[PDB]
């Protein structure tokens, strides 16, 4: 298994306290139930089936964001070795099974508020001694950290080995053909979440490949013309709703393995991710792999927010550092369409039309989000959506480098 993890709590965007009200906690972690594997309990195949368009939690990412903020107020044992209370609520037991209002006879100490708190598993010995039951904490803390480390989109990791796929993964994928991305992401989250597993497990390699294939198809390098061992992802028409992808297997030409093992970190540079299910699912799915296997290497600090500079066990600028790339969906879509034309899947006339459709679609997402922010100003004390500026929708980021990586990743 993996007997240790490191983490980092969220950042207050100038506000003095963590951003969530009692109702958020009461609804998102109430009923005295275990909160430790709930991230997919409020997701589905598509936005149309979800109440993400209005009222509280008016975004795809909204619920998971608040969850992360909520956890930041109660992860003190991995920072100071002691359970605490915040606004009258604390854990029921040293195992951190669930939350409850504080007892009246012997209340625990009140938590002193702080932000961007580094976390070590070793600070709380009982965790390791009860690893078999406290395992789910590992995954969620990792997820929270991977999101907390970045503004705009969360960070996740990619890698491709020099070897071909093992047979076991091939058979597993051959049973996941018609599945949409969201369902796939759930299984990955469900797998790593509920009991310890060793990194040398078939599922671990399986999900690792999925993240690779998803990105390769996202960049358009993997298509009906060119596929990874026969697999690739298919994206919905931009004319109706491009926020959907399904797995496919095909008799097209198979891409050759890279000359050397490739790996990097990724994130979305633009606010569109907050209301785009494929981004959320892809990030969560990829993060699940790193959760069970740990971080392969320190993340490059060069292009990260100020609070992310030089975080112990997480970020670095030395030799043993993996760079992190980022992209904007709109330029990415244009690149994907261009690759399709060069592969001959479409004509030039179609490519122009696809760009117009996707840009129109993205504009709606931006228009919705920007209107939603002023509806929920962060000064209100809870953050349903991460703050941003209008110019953030126009950043091209490192998109050119990103497609270059896929170029080298699937030769």
């Amino acid at each position: 298994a993996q007997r240790q993890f490191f983490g980092l709590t969220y950042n207050f965007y100038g506000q003095p306290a963590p951003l969530f009200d009692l109702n958020d906690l009461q609804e998102l972690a109430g009923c005295y139930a275990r909160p430790w594997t709930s991230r997919f309990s409020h997701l589905a195949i598509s936005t149309g089936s979800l109440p993400v368009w209005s009222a509280r939690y008016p975004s795809v990412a909204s619920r998971n964001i608040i969850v992360n903020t909520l956890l930041g107020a109660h992860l003190n044992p991995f920072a100071g070795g002691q359970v605490t209370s915040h606004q009258g609520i604390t854990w029921r037991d040293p195992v951190l099974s669930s939350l409850a209002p504080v007892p009246a006879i012997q209340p625990p100490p009140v938590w002193a508020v702080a932000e961007n708190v580094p976390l070590d598993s070793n600070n709380y010995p009982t965790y390791v001694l009860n690893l078999s039951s406290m395992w789910p904490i590992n995954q969620d803390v990792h997820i929270m950290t991977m999101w907390a480390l970045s503004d705009q989109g969360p960070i996740y990791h990619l890698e491709v080995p020099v070897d071909p796929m093992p047979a076991a993964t091939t058979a597993a994928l051959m049973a996941y053909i018609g599945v949409p991305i969201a369902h796939l992401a759930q299984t990955a989250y469900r797998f790593a979440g509920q009991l310890p597993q060793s990194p040398d497990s078939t599922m671990v390699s399986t999900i690792r490949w999925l993240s690779a294939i998803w990105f390769g198809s996202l960049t358009g390098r993997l298509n009906r013309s060119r596929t990874c061992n026969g697999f690739y992802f298919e994206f919905a028409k931009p004319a109706l709703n491009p926020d959907q992808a399904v797995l496919k297997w095909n008799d097209g030409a198979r891409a050759a393995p890279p000359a050397a093992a490739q790996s990097s970190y990724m994130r979305c540079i633009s606010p569109h991710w907050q209301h785009q299910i494929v981004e959320v699912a892809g990030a969560l799915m990829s993060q699940s792999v790193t959760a069970v296997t740990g971080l392969p290497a320190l993340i490059d600090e060069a292009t990260l927010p100020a609070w992310s500079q030089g975080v112990a066990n997480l970020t670095g600028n030395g030799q043993g550092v993996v760079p992190c790339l980022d992209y904007n969906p709109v330029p990415m879509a244009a690149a994907r369409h261009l690759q399709w034309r060069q592969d001959g899947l479409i004509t030039a006339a179609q490519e122009a039309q696809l760009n117009n459709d996707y840009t129109a679609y993205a504009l709606t997402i931006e228009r919705h989000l920007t209107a939603m922010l002023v509806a929920n100003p962060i000064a209100a004390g809870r953050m349903p959506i991460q703050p941003f500026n209008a110019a953030d929708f126009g950043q091209a980021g490192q998109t050119a480098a990103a497609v270059a990586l896929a170029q080298a990743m699937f030769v």
């Binding site: 071909p164 093992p166 047979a167 076991a168 091939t170 078939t202």
Partner: protein, 50 residues
Amino acid sequence: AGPMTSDPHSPVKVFMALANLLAQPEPIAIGVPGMHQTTPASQFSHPGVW
């Protein structure tokens, strides 16, 4: 009767058949994740599980 058939996997199947019978006296490591020396030999019916 091995070489008479046309199945490309026939050589491997022939090999594993003996391997099954010798699991106790001559145990070896089959370097294929998801398979064991006691897996029924007839099921080794694919490349990559060789």
